[PDB]
Amino acid sequence: RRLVLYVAGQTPKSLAAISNLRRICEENLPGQYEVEVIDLKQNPRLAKEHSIVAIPTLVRELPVPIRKIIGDLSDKEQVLVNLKM
Amino acid sequence: GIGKSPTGIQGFDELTLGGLPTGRPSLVCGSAGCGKTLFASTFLINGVRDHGEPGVFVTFEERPEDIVNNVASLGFELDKLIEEEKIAIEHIAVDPSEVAEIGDYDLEGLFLRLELAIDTVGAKRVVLDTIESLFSAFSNPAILRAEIRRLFDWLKERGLTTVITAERGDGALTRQGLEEYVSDCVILLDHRVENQISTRRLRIVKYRGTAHGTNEYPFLIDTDGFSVLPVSALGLLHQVHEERIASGVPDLDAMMAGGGFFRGSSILVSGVAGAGKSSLAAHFAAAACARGERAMYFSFEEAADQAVRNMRSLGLDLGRWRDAGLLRFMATRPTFYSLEMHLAVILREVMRFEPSVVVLDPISAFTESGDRLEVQSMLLRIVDFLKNRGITGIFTHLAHTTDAGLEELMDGWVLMLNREVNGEFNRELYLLKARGMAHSNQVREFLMSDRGISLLP
Amino acid sequence: DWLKERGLTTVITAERGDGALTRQGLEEYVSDCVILLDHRVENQISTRRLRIVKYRGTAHGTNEYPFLIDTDGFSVLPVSALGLLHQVHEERIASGVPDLDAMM
Amino acid sequence: GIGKSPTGIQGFDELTLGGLPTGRPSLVCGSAGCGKTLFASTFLINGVR
Amino acid sequence: LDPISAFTESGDRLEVQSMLLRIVDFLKNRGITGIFTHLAHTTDAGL
Amino acid sequence: VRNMRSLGLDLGRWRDAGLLRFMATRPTFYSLEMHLAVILREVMRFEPSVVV
Ligand SMILES: Nc1ncnc2c1ncn2[C@@H]1O[C@H](COP(=O)(O)OP(=O)(O)OP(=O)(O)O)[C@@H](O)[C@H]1O
Ligand SMILES: Nc1ncnc2c1ncn2[C@@H]1O[C@H](COP(=O)(O)OP(=O)(O)O)[C@@H](O)[C@H]1O
Ligand SMILES: Nc1ncnc2c1ncn2[C@@H]1O[C@H](COP(=O)(O)OP(=O)(O)O)[C@@H](O)[C@H]1O
Ligand SMILES: [Mg+2]
Ligand SMILES: [Mg+2]
Ligand SMILES: [Mg+2]
């Protein structure tokens, strides 16, 4: 149960992304998985290592098949459905 | 004036008057197989290996293995140039299967990775290959449009020389409207088939900031890579020589004042089939060889052995000079190559061998290889190259007098006639014209035998 | 990707269409080698031609080569393969006309 | 250089300088009746035999 | 081969010339004596 | 020059004194429009009495 959130800088998109992640994770459901936030600007290399293109990105690696979600996570219901199991 | 970055391709560079603009984006349009990827690859390779500018190759479709293997055959070593980091390859691939879009996204990782590569390699040149896959992957079109407009602005903003590969499409020179964006330089590559013969052409559609060539220039991809020998680069600056050359026929040599035709001149030998044009050319080559000089005999009609045993009847022992290493035979059919590769091979081997007499027999064999204009362009390029090198060119042409519009340049003209009169055939020859000297105006009948070509009294 | 990944040599058959060399955009995918086959009629005579549109990684023929399907199958005798390497012989042949033979 | 797989067709093989690339996909385009199916069939048959 | 001129209208000049050149080259490589008969109307067909 | 020197016409003398001009331009060097433009421009600039 691990989730990674790739963002770049104190951007409105990334800030809203992490805030919305907080909201969906807490109000919608319990703490089933642990979140880790990585800001790409300091480590551009990690962007290549994880093959990231469009900010912001939310990637789950718990299941064998990877799954990514691109954007700021504005739609709570869609984010929850994409992250539900 | 404006800055310009050479691309290694001498013909393209001199056509553009320096090369692509420096610090501006360039668009390379053309259907699949035209050579846009190779164009960008040699761009980067030549920039790194000749002008000391690091390069970055951002590919959106092809993997680094494919990118390296494509140019591996051309003689470049992308493995070594990356193994040394002079060119940095970034395979920026996006898979829409595991992508779900919620909210607004910016192609920030693209910029971060490209900046990381640029700082790693100290790059000054950048190539963007297959940027249409970027549009095909993501769903929102406006976001992608804005993102790469920002990307082009950012590339200009930090001042890198960028070349973009784009497909042609159906309506305009691009199918994704990258012309809207890149107008500093547009180069269209075309691959057209006519009469079953396919040729590759290059055109500079729009180059903003200075003059350039506007015609369609046929180019070739060879072991070296891109090669462009435009017909507009030929100039009439030919250093003349006051020495004379020996044809090998004493009577013909004495017929003209000075002992022979001026050295480095273009000599045409015209006549009907069986007149003896090849015999005269062989006489010229053998006479040049006997003096210790090198000679080449390009033949588009006969094999080396057949020519040998044809001339051995006339006594010219071409085997001796070929075996001692002073005479070269090619024996190449007109249809073996295209016109561009015929020109390129002739030029390359002439430069490598550095001979003193080149005999092309016959120049009329290229009649149906293409249109009259293309063959004339090839012949003019060959003649100008030989004259600039100061080599004596002996061209043999068949007669049916004016033949193909290439007599227009020849310095000397020798017509060989085999006429039927009084129920029997007689041979004759005469100098139709000999520039810069006085010569006999008699139709001297001759008779070929074992001793060679001999003019009757 | 999986076929390349386990390393098999694969040949894909695709229809032409109307706009490009393929109607389903398989050119987007396969660029290692593209071979276009055409069957064109001129003056009521129909001929079959083959062309290598794009072969990535090395040189190749670029012209349109007329080919034939016969009992053996595909047969291609390109006119670009002919070379001027002909071993000559010093013997003579008899035409059957003594006067013509002696004339030379 | 790169690997190449002969396809039995001598003319096509010598045109391609060895044949189709080995380990890579090849596309055969053409309208109905051009001979793509037969091309693939002889490819396989010659490769096996 | 009698006559090589019979193929005049079978196709364009280039195609017939290609066929004739291939035949001649094949015969010469095999070292066979080729006797081609052509009709006259001198140069006939560029072969 | 060395073709005419055989006929005795010493064009070098007049070219060197500055009364004769030679262009020596190939037909394919320019397009027709630029051939015309260059000819007109140089003729106007030099103001000669005989153009061959
Ligand atoms: N020993 C010899 N004695 C007399 N004539 C000879 C001798 N050897 C060759 N010839 C003549 O040379 C002619 C061929 O000359 P050559 O090959 O130079 O002609 P060409 O103009 O180059 O011909 P083509 O149009 O076939 O290229 C033969 O037809 C024959 O008439
Ligand atoms: N070693 C080589 N010699 C001659 N031509 C080559 C060589 N390698 C590749 N080519 C040419 O390059 C072409 C493909 O070039 P590329 O630019 O990669 O594709 P595209 O033109 O579709 O962008 C092939 O169609 C082939 O004619
Ligand atoms: N025994 C044969 N001899 C000559 N040609 C044949 C023979 N069998 C099939 N053909 C040719 O093969 C063609 C069909 O080939 P195929 O590749 O199966 O179809 P397509 O070209 O539509 O893929 C026919 O149009 C025919 O000309
Ligand atoms: Mg390409
Ligand atoms: Mg000859
Ligand atoms: Mg079929």
Q: For an interface test with B, which of C29, C34, C88, C89 has the most B Cβ atoms less than 10 Å from its Cβ? A: C88
Which DSSP string do the residues of A12-28 spell out, in sequence order?
Answer: HHHHHHHHHHHHIIIII
Domains of chain B: 4-228 (3.40.50.300), 250-457 (3.40.50.300)
**Which residues lie below 8 Å from residue F32, measured CB to CB, with a gap of 6+?**
none
Bond into B362 cis (ω within 30): yes
Sign, Cα dihedral of B417, B421, B426, B432:
negative
Q: Which chains touch A (3 or more CB pairs under 8 A)?
A: B
User: What DSSP character marks residue B262?
Assistant: B
**B93 token code pair:** 């691939």
**3-class secondary-structure state, position B270:** strand
Q: How far apart are alpha carbons E35 and E42 in whole angstroms? A: 18
Phi, psi of F22 (to 5 degrees): -120, 140
What long-range pairs does F21-26 form, CB within 8 A, spacing at least 24? F21/F46, F21/F48, F24/B236, F24/B237, F25/B236, F26/B234, F26/B235, F26/B236
**Which residue in the block uniquely carries the two structure tokens 């001297």?**
B444
Which DSSP string do the residues of B338-378 spell out, in sequence order?
Answer: -HHHHHHHHHHHHHHH--SEEEEE-GGGGTTTS-HHHHHHH
Ligand 3: residues whose CB is within 6 Å?
C 69; D 32-38
Angle between helices B277-290 and B304-314 (to 10 degrees): 90
CB contacts of D1 in chain B (<8 Å) are 72-73
Which DSSP string do the residues of C7-61 spell out, in sequence order?
Answer: T--EEEEE---SSSS-SS--TTT--SEEEEEEEEEETTEEEEEEEEEEETTS---
Sign, Cα dihedral of A36, A40, A44, A49:
positive
Number of CB pairs < 8 Å for C and D? 139
Gaps in chain D following residue numbers (C to N > 2.5 A): none
Q: How far apart are alpha carbons B10 and B455 in whole angstroms? A: 49
Residue B319: count of CB within 10 angstroms of its CB: 15
**3-class secondary-structure state, position B167:** coil
Whether D27 contacts chain B with CB within 8 A: no
Residue B268: count of CB within 10 angstroms of its CB: 23
Q: How far apart are alpha carbons B220 and B226 in whole angstroms? A: 6
Q: How far apart are alpha carbons C64 and E10 in whole angstroms? A: 19
Tell me the domain boundaries of chain A. Answer: 1-85
- Closest to B295 measured CA to CA, from B336, B245, B333: B245
Q: How far apart are alpha carbons D42 and C72 in whole angstroms? A: 10
- Closest to B200 measured CA to CA, from B374, B372, B81: B374
The count of residues in chain F is 52
For chain A, first and last CA: distance in Å?
A: 11
Number of CB pairs < 8 Å for B and D? 5
Q: Are B330 and B299 a contacting pair, CB within 8 Å? A: yes
- Closest to B455 measured CA to CA, from B242, B253, B174: B253
Active site residue B194: no
Residue B302: count of CB within 10 angstroms of its CB: 17
Ramachandran region, residue B165 (left: φ > 0; alpha: ψ -120 to 50; beta: rest)? beta
Residue B190: count of CB within 10 angstroms of its CB: 16
Q: How far apart are alpha carbons B32 and B169 in whole angstroms? A: 10
Q: How far apart are alpha carbons A80 and A68 in whole angstroms? A: 13
Whether B306 contacts chain C with CB within 8 A: yes
For chain B, first and last CA: distance in Å?
A: 67
Residue A41: count of CB within 10 angstroms of its CB: 16
CA distances from B88 to B75, B116, D46 (A): 18, 10, 42
Q: How far apart are alpha carbons C46 and C67 in whole angstroms? A: 12
Could A48 and B106 be called an inter-chain contact, meaning their C-beta atoms sit closer than 8 Å? no
3-state secondary structure E1-47: CCCHHHHCCCCCHHHHHHHHHHHHHHHHHHCCCCCCCCCCCCCCCCC
B450 pocket-lining for ligand 1 (C-beta < 6 Å): yes
Q: How far apart are alpha carbons B191 and B158 in whole angstroms? A: 35
- Closest to B90 measured CA to CA, from B45, B57, B132: B57
**B397 token code pair:** 């042409």
**3-class secondary-structure state, position D47:** helix
Cα atoms in the 13 Å half-sphere on the side-chain side of B339? 29
This structure's resolution (angstroms)? Answer: 2.7
Phi, psi of B60 (to 5 degrees): -100, -15
CB contacts of D19 in chain C (<8 Å) are none
CB contacts of C45 in chain E (<8 Å) are 10-11
Bond into E3 cis (ω within 30): yes
- Cα C73 to chain centroid distance, Å, stands at 13
Q: How far apart are alpha carbons B44 and B56 in whole angstroms? A: 8
**Which residue in the block uniquely carries the two structure tokens 């992304």?**
A17
B73 pocket-lining for ligand 2 (C-beta < 6 Å): yes
Buried residues in B366-403 as b, exposed as e (16+ CB within 10 A): beebbeeebbbbbbbbbbbbbbebebbbbbbbbbeeee
Active-site residue among B14, B132, B179, B301?
B301
Closest approach of chain B CAs to the CA of F36, in angstroms?
17
Strands B87-91, B197-207: parallel, antiparallel or unpaired by DSSP?
unpaired
**B274 token code pair:** 């069986």
Q: How far apart are alpha carbons B411 and B44 in whole angstroms? A: 44
Ligand lying nearest the CA atom of residue B341: 2
Closest approach of chain F CAs to the CA of B384, in angstroms?
11
**Which residue in the block uniquely carries the two structure tokens 């190759």?**
B57
Could B196 and E14 be called an inter-chain contact, meaning their C-beta atoms sit closer than 8 Å? yes
**3-class secondary-structure state, position B185:** strand
Partners of B100 in the β-ladder? A69
**B321 token code pair:** 């000079």
Q: Are B260 and B245 a contacting pair, CB within 8 Å? A: yes
Q: How far apart are alpha carbons B233 and B215 in whole angstroms? A: 12
**B153 token code pair:** 């602005």
Which member of B106, B115, B116 has the closest CB to residue A13?
B106
- Closest to B122 measured CA to CA, from B92, B157, B163, B84: B84
Q: Are B128 and B164 a contacting pair, CB within 8 Å? A: yes
**B326 token code pair:** 């002073």
- Closest to C81 measured CA to CA, from E43, A36, B337, F23: B337
Strands (E), chain A: 2-7, 34-39, 57-60, 67-71
Q: How far apart are alpha carbons B10 and B227 in whole angstroms? A: 8
User: What DSSP character marks residue B106?
Assistant: B
Q: How far apart are alpha carbons B75 and B49 in whole angstroms? A: 13
Residue F19: count of CB within 10 angstroms of its CB: 10
Q: Are F24 and F1 a contacting pair, CB within 8 Å? A: no
**Which residues lie below 8 Å from residue C88, measured CB to CB, with a gap of 6+?**
B303, B305, B306, B308, B309
Rg over CA atoms, chain E: 11
**B405 token code pair:** 């519009």
**B353 token code pair:** 């061998």
Active site residue B301: yes
Q: Which chains touch D (3 or more CB pairs under 8 A)?
A: B, C
**3-class secondary-structure state, position B445:** strand
Ramachandran region, residue B225 (left: φ > 0; alpha: ψ -120 to 50; beta: rest)? left
Q: How far apart are alpha carbons A48 and B112 in whole angstroms? A: 9
Buried residues in B145-173 as b, exposed as e (16+ CB within 10 A): eebbeebbeebeeeebbbbbbbbbbeeeb
C34 pocket-lining for ligand 2 (C-beta < 6 Å): no
**B404 token code pair:** 């193909």
Chains C and D touch (3+ CB pairs under 8 A): yes
**Which residues lie below 8 Å from residue F38, measured CB to CB, with a gap of 6+?**
F25, F30
**3-class secondary-structure state, position A56:** coil
- Closest to B377 measured CA to CA, from B351, B348, B339, B408: B339
Sign, Cα dihedral of B73, B76, B77, B82:
negative
The residue of chain F nearest to residue B212, with distances taken between CA atoms, is: F30
**Which residues lie below 8 Å from residue C52, measured CB to CB, with a gap of 6+?**
C33, C34, C35, C60, C61, C62, D15, D16
Q: How far apart are alpha carbons A55 and B453 in whole angstroms? A: 85
Q: How far apart are alpha carbons D31 and D28 in whole angstroms? A: 10
Which DSSP string do the residues of D5-39 spell out, in sequence order?
Answer: E--S-HHHHHHHTSSEETTSEEEEE--TTSSHHHH
Phi, psi of D12 (to 5 degrees): -65, -40
- Closest to D4 measured CA to CA, from D16, D18, D15: D18
Rg over CA atoms, chain C: 23
State the method: cryo-EM
Whether C18 contacts chain B with CB within 8 A: no
**Which residue in the block uniquely carries the two structure tokens 């003689």?**
B75
Measured in Å, residue B36 CA sits from the centre of ligand 4 at 6
**D22 token code pair:** 């080995």
CA distances from B453 to B250, B293, B297 (A): 9, 22, 19
Which DSSP string do the residues of B204-230 spell out, in sequence order?
Answer: EEEETTS----S-EEEEE-SS-EE---
Q: How far apart are alpha carbons B454 and B55 in whole angstroms? A: 66
Q: Are C26 and C14 a contacting pair, CB within 8 Å? A: yes
Q: Are B420 and B406 a contacting pair, CB within 8 Å? A: no
Which DSSP string do the residues of B51-105 spell out, in sequence order?
Answer: S---EEEEESSS-HHHHHHHHHTTT--HHHHHHTTSEEEEE----STTEEEES--
